[PDB]
Swiss-Prot record:
Phosphoserine modifications at: 20, 25, 32
Gene: Prkab1
Keyword field: Fatty acid biosynthesis, Fatty acid metabolism, Lipid biosynthesis, Lipid metabolism, Lipoprotein, Myristate, Phosphoprotein
GO cellular component: cytoplasm; cytosol; nucleotide-activated protein kinase complex; nucleus; protein-containing complex
Domain of life the protein comes from: Eukaryota
The protein's name in its UniProt record: 5'-AMP-activated protein kinase subunit beta-1
Residues of the full protein shown: 77 to 163 of 270
Residues modified to Phosphothreonine: 72
UniProt source species: Rattus norvegicus
Assembly description: AMPK is a heterotrimer of an alpha catalytic subunit (PRKAA1 or PRKAA2), a beta (PRKAB1 or PRKAB2) and a gamma non-catalytic subunits (PRKAG1, PRKAG2 or PRKAG3). Interacts with FNIP1 and FNIP2.
Known tissue expression: Highly expressed in kidney, heart, white adipose tissue, lung and spleen.
Keyword Lipoprotein: yes
Record remark: domains: The glycogen-binding domain may target AMPK to glycogen so that other factors like glycogen-bound debranching enzyme or protein phosphatases can directly affect AMPK activity.
Similarity section: Belongs to the 5'-AMP-activated protein kinase beta subunit family.
Post-translation changes: Phosphorylated when associated with the catalytic subunit (PRKAA1 or PRKAA2). Phosphorylated by ULK1; leading to negatively regulate AMPK activity and suggesting the existence of a regulatory feedback loop between ULK1 and AMPK.
GO molecular function, one term: protein kinase binding
Amino acid sequence: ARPTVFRWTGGGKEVYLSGSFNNWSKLPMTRSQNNFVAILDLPEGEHQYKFFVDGQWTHDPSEPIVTSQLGTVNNIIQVKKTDFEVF
Ligand SMILES: OC[C@H]1O[C@@H]2O[C@H]3[C@H](O)[C@@H](O)[C@@H](O[C@H]4[C@H](O)[C@@H](O)[C@@H](O[C@H]5[C@H](O)[C@@H](O)[C@@H](O[C@H]6[C@H](O)[C@@H](O)[C@@H](O[C@H]7[C@H](O)[C@@H](O)[C@@H](O[C@H]8[C@H](O)[C@@H](O)[C@@H](O[C@H]1[C@H](O)[C@H]2O)O[C@@H]8CO)O[C@@H]7CO)O[C@@H]6CO)O[C@@H]5CO)O[C@@H]4CO)O[C@@H]3CO
């Protein structure tokens, strides 16, 4: 697994990260420079995720998106060879 950084820049007071990599639980993100950050060690390959921002599910319009099998919109990124790449 590679260290991988998620950064929410869309504002809010309290933000959780939810994704395929945590079985769609809600990881509290750390407030940092007016943004929210979380760092996970993730295997190389595809990951879907979304944000829970002040009680509302939201995706990041600046990362790629895909429609899940549930009929919902997730972000989709690919972890590659770069420690601490930011998504
Ligand atoms: O919890 C896991 C989950 O979290 C994230 O989903 C959140 C999402 O981002 C929010 O927007 C909100 O979702 C609500 C949504 O906006 C509403 O539209 C409504 O959803 C309705 C759908 O619109 C509608 O399509 C229908 O859904 C049916 C499906 O069409 C049908 O295919 C089937 O779904 C089953 C799947 O086929 C199956 O794969 C399995 O789903 C899993 C996903 O594949 C997987 O990605 C993950 O889902 C994430 C998700 O991607 C995030 O965005 O986990 C799933 C397993 O838990 O299971 C499905 C059966 O449950 O069945 C459904 C009908 O049940 O109906 C709904 C009406 O409810 O409501 C949404 C809120 O419930 O919230 C979610 C978190 O809840």
